Design a protein around this ligand. Sequence first.
Ligand code: NDP
Ligand code: SF4
Ligand code: SF4
Ligand code: SF4
Lengths: 288, 156, 176, 114, 80, 208
Amino acid sequence: LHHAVIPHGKGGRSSVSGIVATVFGATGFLGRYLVNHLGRMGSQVIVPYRCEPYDTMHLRPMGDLGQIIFMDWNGRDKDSIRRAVEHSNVVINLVGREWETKNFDFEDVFVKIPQAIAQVSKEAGVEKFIHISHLNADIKSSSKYLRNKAVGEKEVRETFPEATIIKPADIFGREDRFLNYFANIKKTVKQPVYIVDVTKGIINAIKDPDARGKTFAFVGPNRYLLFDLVQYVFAVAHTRDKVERIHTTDRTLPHLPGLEDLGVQATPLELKAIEVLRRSEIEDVQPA
Amino acid sequence: SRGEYVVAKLDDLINWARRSSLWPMTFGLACCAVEMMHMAAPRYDMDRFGVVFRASPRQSDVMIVAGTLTNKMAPALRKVYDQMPEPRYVVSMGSCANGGGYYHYSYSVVRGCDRIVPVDIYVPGCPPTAEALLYGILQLQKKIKREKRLRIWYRR
Amino acid sequence: TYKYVNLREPSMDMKSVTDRAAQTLLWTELIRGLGMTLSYLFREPATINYPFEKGPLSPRFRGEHALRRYPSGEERCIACKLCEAVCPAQAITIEAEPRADGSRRTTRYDIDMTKCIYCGFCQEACPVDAIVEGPNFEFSTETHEELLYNKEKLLNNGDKWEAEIAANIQADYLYR
Amino acid sequence: TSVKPIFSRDMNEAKRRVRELYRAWYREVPNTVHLFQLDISVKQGRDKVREMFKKNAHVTDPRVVDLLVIKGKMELEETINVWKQRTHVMRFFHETEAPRPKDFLSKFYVGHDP
Amino acid sequence: PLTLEGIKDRVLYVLKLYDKIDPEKLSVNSHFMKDLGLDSLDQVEIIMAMEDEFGFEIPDIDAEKLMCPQEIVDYIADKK
Amino acid sequence: TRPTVRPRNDVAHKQLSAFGEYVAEILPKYVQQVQVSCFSELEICIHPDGVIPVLTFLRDHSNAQFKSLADLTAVDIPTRQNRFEIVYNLLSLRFNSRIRVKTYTDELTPVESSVSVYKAANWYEREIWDMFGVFFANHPDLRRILTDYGFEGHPFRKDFPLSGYVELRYDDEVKRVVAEPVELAQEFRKFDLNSPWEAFPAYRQPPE
Ligand SMILES: NC(=O)C1=CN([C@@H]2O[C@H](COP(=O)(O)OP(=O)(O)OC[C@H]3O[C@@H](n4cnc5c(N)ncnc54)[C@H](OP(=O)(O)O)[C@@H]3O)[C@@H](O)[C@H]2O)C=CC1
Ligand code: SF4
Ligand code: SF4
Ligand code: SF4
């Protein structure tokens, strides 16, 4: 291929690695951590932000000079998106919102966004189209949000089928959402996995081609009850569709490639629980 | 129509109130501290632009990183950078701060405050002119003018 | 050659000792300090109207790092690498090639505005005064990457003015 | 050949000093790991401390061994003080991989790193 | 109440509290340095564990003079 | 030869020469070299055992007071089995002259902790300990001044390169400023300037 893309030396701090990554979203949780892992690897990140430039400006210095580029976009027009994916090596899409707006439903962001960006991805002729989703997002009932994400899964498999639809379980981290709902204040099977396992899997799958066409699902290493999780989060620590999703179910699907096909070690609960549970009574039930 | 109009004029009013005073704290290690205290000189005013230097980080909205930031120093720099309100703005002043610069080599010296905090205004010079520093401060206020925070919050 | 102070006694006469007692108990010289501060309060201060007035400077002030060129002529530099040889941060990077016309040229002239300690050595070392310490001091850049000037950047920088630079050189070519 | 040593007359005083220093390091763990507000288990840090002691095991001259005793003594002084923050204590840990193993093949792909 | 058998039993359960030893194997002539495969680092770990559990200073040359749990019981019963 | 050439004098030269010869006579036990500079600042090259007798002799003895302690650094020179040089500078208060005690040492064998005679020696000593690695005999406090707490390697040495092996940067992953191995953007182009043709032929060492 053309030069200035081939890797050179180590990684990080304006190192020349192999990849050029265009990330959609990235202002929130997982996209920001993935920008930090790309700066750790030392690649070039193309981030279009639609929000105020203060947010991208205080997450600016995470890389070195030349390692990032900022641009502007709307979620309605193909021209700005094609201008974003003019010279792009790989592209990832991260999208998701807790409540709908006056201009966006759960549908047509999970529908109209991956149709358009997958369209210009397949038109631009790129590789490693990686689109995220959620565990057990059925076509069927119990969640408008999960059925809209399943429609997004179906459409990402529809247009450019050589892609990676990647679903984790309800992941936790330093800026977790549902555990923040748990802290600041029925039967449920659940196994949460920590964020760094997921994003290490993402960077492994995006530096390892032959991954085009395969879909991923991630597993928490414990498989215990939500009520014991509440017991623990208050033991130490001393919307409606969101609470229905976390009270629905979270099961395993061993028929698509997950963790050890990628060859990565999972991280336990208690370490990162003692990390984020700032501001020793460990239950550790783990039923099967 | 009237909603966008009210949001526009209200955002103009509150951003004007932001860029009005902006009283900072002075970090100031090496001779760029003397240059900061000489934009605190009587000739080049600060009162005219609502600026009064005060080292209390509980109210310091803008913060000027000046002096040679060292690898022995910088975690305390981010420690002071933490407890600071929701708009926080950084002026990298000086060749020592704008990339490390003259001491871009020489171990236990950071290659500029970009490796620690974001920088919202870069002003080069060794020493930068205090007049040029004040020019960069007015450009910082015009960046405050160009935010449309409430407009983004409405059109979300 | 020594002139030491504070070796004088307070007088043990009643006069000076009760005058110092009046100073102590009656707050005299503190009020004299108030009068001094009021005497400077009724002045007119030495400030400047900053967007409208710009203060004094020198003809030898070292700012912009701009380039010159010849009278109706070519690019003034030679790529003789003296400025890179003497730059105290190695902020100069000159990758040079000749063009086929015979006149020697460059490829890439590079000044790290981050790394410039603003000497004047590259001014005083250039034989033709290609790189000139500039007159104006207004950079104030919002981004990090824009502080890395290139060759055509400095050429367009020199294309905005020379008459200021030529005036400073015409006043300052005789003292050096 | 007549060279003055630091402290010791054979390696026995050196072994005495270094095992007393390691006993001080072992008793020095729990107070500081509760004080520094850390997130790494006591077993992992203690095994890394004894592994760092076992790293320099190929040294037999007692002058150097007493010098390393003085090094670790200064280290335990600066950690029994609250001078060192979370930064250096985590800097002993190596969490910023750099994943390159001693495979010939992983050194073949990421080239020029023999 | 500090009996010799009480010292031996408490040495026994704190060696059981010690994890790396495989198995416990309370041998009165064990010498787990060269007969079970433990370091002098592990030796000073064990003797300072004794120092933690049941008493006195135990300077490290006297720690080297033990090497075996029954002789630890003998030295402490002589000492306590 | 007359104009614009730096004037020197034989008076201070003869005074310091006779005084250095006098000191070498009255202490035959540790003096090796008494070199008088042409610009009249005395240097005395010294064995590292009677350093405290030398300092107690040079604080006093009523023919030359020298109550002023000054620069000392064991200036990093390779190629020698005795690498480091402890140069104690002494400045008088009554007689206005400058003498230097250059005693030699190597890396491992310690010098003998001059804080016992001079009150201003301690931070200098601790500085030389953190920077070069010169150990002391019955010294109060060896801590680290002018360096990072986690940094090692005695960086003033010719063993130590220009850059370090640490590079601090913040990450939000583990939420702190960590130290990574070095990632240099610029070469540090080492401009070699050692031109031939021997400008000072009087300082030529005799070859093989
Ligand atoms: N357990 C978990 O937390 C799980 C997380 N995820 C995924 O993780 C990611 C981060 O989640 P979270 O931090 O909670 O939510 P966020 O809203 O913060 O992250 C989504 C990102 O996409 C942007 N985005 C989303 N919807 C729109 C829209 N309509 N128009 C424009 N931009 C949009 C967001 O805001 P902006 O536009 O300002 O950039 C942000 O950058 C999401 O992609 C989510 O689907 C999936 C499954 C489980
Ligand atoms: S940039 Fe120059 S003037 Fe400013 S602190 Fe550094 S050396 Fe001093
Ligand atoms: S000194 Fe002048 S002519 Fe020579 S390389 Fe530099 S700019 Fe060009
Ligand atoms: S003035 Fe700037 S560019 Fe010129 S020699 Fe000095 S540091 Fe280098």
